[PDB]
Design a protein around this ligand. Structure first.
Ligand SMILES: Cn1nccc1Cc1ccc2c(c1)CCN([C@@H]1CCN(C(=O)c3ccnc(NC4CCC4)c3)C[C@H]1O)C2
Ligand SMILES: Cn1nccc1Cc1ccc2c(c1)CCN([C@@H]1CCN(C(=O)c3ccnc(NC4CCC4)c3)C[C@H]1O)C2
Ligand SMILES: CSC[C@H]1O[C@@H](n2cnc3c(N)ncnc32)[C@H](O)[C@@H]1O
Ligand SMILES: CSC[C@H]1O[C@@H](n2cnc3c(N)ncnc32)[C@H](O)[C@@H]1O
Ligand SMILES: [Cl-]
Ligand SMILES: [Cl-]
Ligand code: NA
Ligand code: NA
Ligand code: NA
Ligand code: NA
Ligand code: NA
Ligand code: NA
Ligand code: NA
Ligand code: NA
Ligand code: NA
Lengths: 622, 301, 622, 303
């Protein structure tokens, strides 16, 4: 259910106040740490030498209460970007004082507003404070979904609210945040507390906040419609926004005073609770994928490295994938050997990379479902996995399965194969080097032989996630290129991100290859929003046999298949993409005798550097 | 409470003091009445007093026995002075604003008032019915000051950190009108109507400049650098040809002529000067209160 | 209580066997992952092409069981340091196979023996395996407390067991471990499984294993004496060793077969359980210090940095420290102003660094315990702490305490002080810059004025901890000197370590200083054991007043005082110290106007580099 | 005085040719290291297995001559950004071959053209070659001050040269260079060989090349106006550009054949020599500051 807090700008007795909001049902409290109206002078006498105390004691709460329950708030008088030199200097000294007192109490987070376009000095003072010892504290930047200027009542006679649409103008609130976080150098301690007004803007304004680090969503009591009974509720479009925020797992803050006076304050929380308990309850894919969201992982190399026992275990339990592999064999057996030939014709069937033999089992089920005889070979290079097969061969299968403890590129076969069945695909189709492996195994396929899979195709899509860009940037390691982390792909269940164009195909491979494996592909992605490009999401589709396919391409995604998450190709420097412009990306598949690697560059609307030139940052071992 | 916010002389010559705790364990407020003005601030020599649940940001007399308060809580509350004037009791305390109520002003009738909150909204009140008539979100930032027209209910001034001074006329379908100097100068903070010209006012900015404005001419006739820091209050004298008292965060009082020339200045305060009120009994006597808990009584030459 | 395992070299049914040892009461099982006698050929036909399976299936247990319950064991036939080229090559290929299969199952640890002096190739093959992907698996090196050659029965007529003492000879088992772990470059994945024979060696042989990473202690059933009833027990000297190992929190392994046949196998565990439940149950200091053992921490700088609220909170609850500070003031008040002068004479008393005012409170209690009038000043530079004082001054103290929000070096005082009371000591006496602070505050002390404390002295002691040496080495950070971590002191509750000499005094300071603060001290430490120097433990004593003192010097340690843990000055390269030799260490206190820092070097028996020259790695801010 | 080279696309006898250009007065020679028209197949039989040798021997010059006198040139047929997959793959293999042979001879620099907008694959192949061992060799990217498309004669009836000004359009040649060097990640081994046509563009197009790493300035014989006597000279606006380039201390390359046939080829160098000897001779500041140009220094802290 929903983790939620109360925003107050008035706290007479911190003891009574905090006891009341917890009784109301809130998990934490956003309050001032100095009285909001208590303006303080640091330069000019005699106000400079104002007798203390300057705020209320740290003794009034336990360190645990400060650590868990209290979010700080910058006093509203503090304006570091004032046009007055004196008010700037006071605000500078005042801001450091309030932030340093926040750090003293050990507050989990501290709220700072983005009220205006120019928050340059505010960013500088916060940046100064962040680089004052490595101290883990969050800074929630309060940004409105719509600026107060652009939702004001049309009641000023000689200055009317423009009755025209300014596409970029209505997104100015995002440029406030972008300019701020960019000045602060994408600090993981700086997140968005998005404030939601009575009337939502256009979706493109709301979509603008996808991939941004939203930690809190602020709901003023004013935006809640009253219903027949008297309870507070929200519009269908407000509910949509709340549902999207609950997926991002934000903390919901209630600001403003009670307007539904004939109700307890929990009435507002009760509705949020009711909402989050009445979201759609997916899924096959989602519930299995819960925990892996925006979590970066090195792409596995089952060729170069021997996969661990538990790794195998979790990927032989994907019934969709093996249902499809079973049916693929099922149909191939029928198409190859006729009915009258069923007892005479036995099909030499070879599983190339059999691991613990879920494809060997799939081949057996398919055989006595189609009612055709088969001779099995289980070729496996991983000698640890071969132990599992030979134990299973002796115990269960018998001489039907010949377990071969070899590399398929090396193995000199006794007889040629009717069907070669393989499982060597990665998140980006060919990134686990299925092409090179099957090419080396192709010579022992019969002249009229089938490969399962017959075909696979990789897909790319440009994405925006400042969140995922931060995660990559945080992967800098000692004793290598400082930017190496940007020049390598990550497997990741992309969650807080924005797909900026429809996925398009990158690289295709066919088996058998009746014709090299190096590739160069230029893609043009039409972008219909203002955004920031951080990298390219990679997916794949594969033709196992005829109409039986597997896909993690979101459009055509195989239902509830958890075998593959999408891959992410980052870029060093984010590229500003204005509405209408085209993202032109370039992808190479490069190789020598020893390594296979991807190189990539953006050529529009701006040129990026060529990423991973000569595989200097990332190679896949042959 | 150490920090004094408001100080207003009643017709008969009694002194109303609004106060708040802006530091310490408790952050509440209080309202006092002093029938002996040379006794203040000393609590031990007062006529009546009461504690509010939260601090007071601004205060106004509603006639003779009424006290309208702008609370930190986000409430506008009306406290009633007793039949003996020895007890102050709450009539209405209405939580209608979503942030600190920072300014209040009673309209010429005395049956209605307008408030200005940090939630950016201006609201018009019916003190008889204790409900809100109008709710105006005109500004784009904290509503700093709202000053009622001396002689017109439908008219009043307001200024905000959006750098707008709005002349209001609720008779109009678009009640607000932006009015000020040629160029967009420093932010307006204090507003005082001229008592004899219904169409001119003075606005003090955050840079310490006090400016004389004509609504009719829509151009600033004369300004002057009075204070070194922000102008927090502007109050006219009851004189036939009135003096202008200007308050500031530079902890200095100044009293000016019709052309904003310096006639008097006091460095008596050691903290910020919050409110000033002229003696109705002795027009040469001006009373200030500050956050230094001082109630200084000035003789003006 | 005791985490314990069973060592078996015979496992017919892994299912039944593991079910039995868990029923016996063990937490885990040490077994072979290939049949111990199943020798395997990798080079020469026809044994090269031996049909599989090569061991039992990974399917026979859950991944959880492999992850938690199973410790692997290198097959005893595997001898990578054999004199036969062929047996070396087979053992090489065989060892990688057993280690790689261990990693496949995801075993928490894998056992390898140190049987002989030359385990060079064994170390090389394990080192090769460790640098085959960053994979978190422990390697317990099985080392005997006494070598089997040196505990053999004196029953070989023409080769008798020498009836002479060889001090170094009886420690050869440690040089086995030292040479191995040194070749493997002090890998945190390589720990000691110390095996304890029937007859213990001399204490110096046992002491040799202090500071070494002991994860397991192996107890053969043979070493257990039988008692009157029939139960297994251990000798008083064996119990001592077990008690010392229980402090190191080792896992106890039971090897060998049951010799107490009229008892269940838990009889052995029951005794270990009984033993660990009948250890002495300290302490005031130990129970408060439980969790901080061999945990490295940056030394706090209360001057350069403002201390956090919770930091203060935990260090105003040390009743011993403030009992001593109270009594120190108590006695000074009596000595200064006579009885007949008690009501006439008020003593101007100044707390320099009052924080949240536990010394201000101590000064008040002392005053109306001695029955003398005092005027208090609470000077505090931390403005966050000043808020706590001014709140407490207004609420409780009154005008008796003048809270001063200033630095004591800057503060221009109204009147001179009778007593200046301070609290500016660190783990190494002067490392929090008490000297510089009080020097700057000295001018406003009365000509006949007392300082509390009057005196403090830092102590150093050479230590051996390969464990703590690893912890320092692991503190290498990007964007600084690769060896910076060695050139700075750490606060640490030194636990798994060996004190190689009696602590000796380093630097002393007196207040008031009636006479600079830069120092140079040479120490000579007589060492009466063979050992390896890894750094110098630092402690301190202080004279608050006359006979009232505080100390973390282990000999004279203030009872149950948790305010200070010892400091550790590491060294880049461990220095071999042979029995009889002297450790000569050099310590400088260096400073300019801005920084204070320590430099140090070992000059005997070998020269180290001068550590932290010009404070390049570590400075303390003024 | 001026360090200058000769650009030839025809070299019958490397011995005679190099002996002639040195006699002409040039300091170095820009030539092909494989015959420009000798197109080579790497994939498809039977051209794949063409008997060698594939070019002329490294024995024909001293290592010193290769090290000092010879600038390589990418064979003009090599088009890594061709629309044809086959021509791309051949051009890829061919480019690595010519660059790797350049590195074998130890050439001070090797010339590659920026002819079109999309030189993405060209940049990728050069980037691949640069990260093949840390080997100090310069790559002069041949860029025109004005693209050949935007100085073509207005003689195509159904496609006329636009009589309008495109401020950014006339700078497209700079975006060619910018996009290339950005893709190659600002390699210090990648510099500009700026090629100057008969008619200069607007100053803003020329100003566009300030702060860019210009190592060479290429002057075709065609851009030289003839005078009364017969000598080659340049327009006052061309002289200005040459004077600005002499401050950057660029190497001047002469490409194209002799159009002033009644003169020795030094006639062109003689003019460059005459020009650089008749620049204004500042200065008080400049002569004292000569050596410190674009040389980074830590700011002194006398305190
Ligand atoms: C048992 N056996 N025995 C023989 C063959 C097999 C099956 C097998 C052998 C290898 C592989 C497979 C299946 C599926 C795909 N693998 C790789 C796994 C990590 N990869 C991911 O994309 C990825 C990351 C993290 N979590 C993921 N899914 C979560 C949802 C809960 C599990 C997927 C990249 C992918 O290529 C290789
Ligand atoms: C409340 N107030 N208010 C005013 C003054 C004080 C008391 C106060 C102000 C600072 C200090 C003190 C006491 C004691 C000593 N500190 C420093 C603390 C960390 N230092 C340690 O050595 C250390 C590390 C980690 N754990 C430790 N002990 C564990 C056992 C459970 C707590 C000690 C180094 C030492 O100088 C400075
Ligand atoms: C199920 S992931 C593919 C499986 O095939 C195996 N494999 C990968 N490459 C090869 C190869 N070239 N020859 C044989 N098996 C392979 C891997 O060890 C893994 O168990
Ligand atoms: C109890 S640890 C010592 C305390 O004294 C304070 N302190 C340290 N150095 C100084 C100084 N030079 N002047 C005043 N207070 C100090 C620190 O902020 C801390 O609260
Ligand atoms: Cl999906
Ligand atoms: Cl102790
Ligand atoms: Na929180
Ligand atoms: Na950036
Ligand atoms: Na490579
Ligand atoms: Na690599
Ligand atoms: Na274990
Ligand atoms: Na070492
Ligand atoms: Na220094
Ligand atoms: Na330092
Ligand atoms: Na050259």
């Amino acid at each position: 259910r929903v983790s939620s807090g109360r925003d107050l700008n008035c706290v007479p007795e911190i003891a009574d106040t905090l006891g009341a909001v917890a009784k109301q049902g809130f998990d934490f409290l956003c309050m001032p740490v100095f009285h909001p109206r208590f303006k303080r002078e640091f330069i000019q006498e005699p106000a400079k030498n104002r007798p203390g105390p300057q705020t209320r004691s740290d003794l009034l709460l336990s360190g645990r209460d400060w650590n868990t329950l209290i979010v700080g708030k910058l006093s509203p008088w503090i304006r570091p970007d004032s046009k007055v030199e004196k008010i700037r200097r006071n605000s500078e000294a005042a801001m450091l004082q309030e932030l340093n007192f926040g750090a003293y109490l050990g507050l989990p987070a501290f709220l700072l507003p983005l009220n205006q376009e120019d928050n340059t000095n505010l960013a500088r003072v916060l940046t100064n404070h962040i680089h004052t010892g490595h101290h883990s504290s969050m800074f929630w930047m309060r940004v409105p979904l719509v600026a107060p200027e652009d939702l004001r009542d049309d009641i000023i006679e000689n200055a009317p609210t423009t009755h025209t649409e300014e596409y970029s103008g209505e997104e100015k609130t995002w440029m406030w945040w972008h300019n701020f976080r960019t000045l602060c150098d994408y600090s993981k301690r700086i997140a968005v507390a998005l404030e939601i007004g009575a009337d939502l803007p256009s979706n493109h304004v709301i979509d603008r906040w996808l991939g941004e680090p939203i930690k809190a969503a602020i709901l003023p009591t004013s935006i809640f419609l009253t219903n027949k009974k008297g309870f507070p509720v929200l519009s269908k479009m407000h509910q949509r926004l709340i549902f999207r925020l609950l997926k991002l797992e934000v903390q919901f803050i209630i600001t403003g005073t009670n307007h539904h006076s004939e109700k307890e304050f929990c009435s507002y929380l009760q509705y949020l609770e009711y909402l989050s308990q009445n979201r759609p309850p997916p899924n096959a894919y989602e519930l299995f994928a819960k925990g892996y969201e925006d979590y970066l992982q090195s792409p596995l190399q089952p060729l170069m490295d021997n996969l661990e026992s538990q790794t195998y275990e979790v990927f032989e339990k994907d019934p969709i994938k093996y249902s499809q592999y079973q049916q693929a064999i099922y149909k191939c057996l029928l198409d190859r050997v006729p009915e009258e030939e069923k007892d005479t014709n036995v099909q030499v069937l070879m599983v190339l990379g059999a691991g613990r033999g879920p494809l060997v089992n799939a081949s057996l089920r398919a055989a006595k479902q189609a009612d055709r005889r088969i001779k099995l070979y289980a070729v496996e290079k991983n000698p640890n996995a071969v132990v599992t097969l030979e134990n299973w061969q002796f115990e269960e299968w018998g001489s039907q399965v010949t377990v071969v403890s070899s590399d398929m590129r090396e193995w000199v076969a006794p007889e040629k194969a009717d069907i070669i069945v393989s499982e060597l695909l990665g998140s980006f189709a060919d990134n686990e080097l299925s092409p090179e492996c099957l090419d080396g195994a192709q010579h022992f396929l019969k002249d009229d032989g089938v490969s399962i899979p017959g075909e696979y195709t990789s897909f790319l899509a440009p994405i925006s996630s400042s969140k995922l860009y931060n995660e990559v940037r945080a992967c800098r390691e000692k004793d290598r290129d400082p930017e190496a982390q940007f020049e390598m792909p990550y497997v990741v269940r992309l969650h807080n991100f924005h797909q900026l164009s429809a996925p398009q195909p990158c690289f295709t491979f066919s088996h058998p290859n009746r014709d090299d494996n190096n590739r160069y592909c230029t893609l043009e992605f039409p972008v219909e929003v203002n955004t920031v490009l951080h990298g390219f999401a990679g997916y794949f589709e594969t033709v196992l046999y005829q109409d039986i396919t597997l896909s993690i391409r979101p459009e055509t995604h195989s239902p509830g298949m958890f075998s593959w998450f999408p891959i992410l190709f980052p870029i060093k420097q984010p590229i500003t993409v204005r509405e209408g412009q085209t993202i032109c990306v370039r992808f190479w598949r490069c190789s020598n005798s020893k390594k296979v690697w991807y190189e990539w560059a953006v050529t529009a609307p701006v040129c990026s550097a060529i990423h991973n030139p000569t595989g200097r940052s990332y190679t896949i071992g042959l | 409470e150490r920090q004094l916010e408001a100080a207003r002389y009643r017709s008969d010559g009694a002194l109303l003091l609004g106060a708040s705790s802006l530091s310490g364990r408790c952050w509440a407020g209080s309202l006092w009445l002093f029938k002996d003005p040379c006794a203040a601030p000393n609590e031990g020599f007062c006529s009546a007093g009461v504690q509010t649940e939260a601090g007071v940001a601004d205060l106004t007399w509603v006639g003779e026995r009424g006290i309208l308060v702008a609370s930190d809580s986000g409430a506008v509350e009306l406290w009633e002075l007793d039949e003996n004037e020895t007890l102050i009791v709450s009539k209405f305390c209405k939580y209608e604003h979503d942030d600190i109520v920072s300014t209040v002003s009673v309209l010429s009738s005395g049956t209605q008032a307008v408030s200005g909150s940090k939630d950016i909204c201006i609201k018009v009140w019916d003190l008889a019915q204790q409900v809100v008539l109008s709710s105006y979100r005109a500004h784009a930032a904290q509503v700093t000051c709202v000053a009622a027209s001396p002689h017109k209910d439908s008219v009043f001034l307001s200024c905000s950190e959006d750098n707008r001074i709005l002349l209001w006329d609720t008779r109009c379908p678009k009640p607000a009108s932006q009015i000020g100097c040629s160029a967009p100068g420093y932010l307006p903070t204090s507003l005082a109507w001229h008592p004899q010209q219904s169409e001119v006012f003075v606005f003090g900015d955050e840079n310490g400049t006090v400016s004389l404005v004509d609504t009719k001419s829509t151009s600033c006739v004369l300004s002057s650098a009075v204070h070194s820091q922000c102008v927090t209050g502007l109050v006219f004298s009851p004189h036939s040809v009135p003096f202008l008292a200007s308050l500031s965060e530079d902890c200095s009082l100044a009293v000016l002529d019709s052309s904003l020339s310096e006639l008097f200045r006091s460095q008596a305060h050691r903290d910020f000067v919050r409110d000033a009120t002229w003696s109705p009994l002795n027009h040469s006597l001006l009373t200030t209160v500050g956050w230094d808990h001082q109630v200084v009584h000035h003789v003006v030459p």
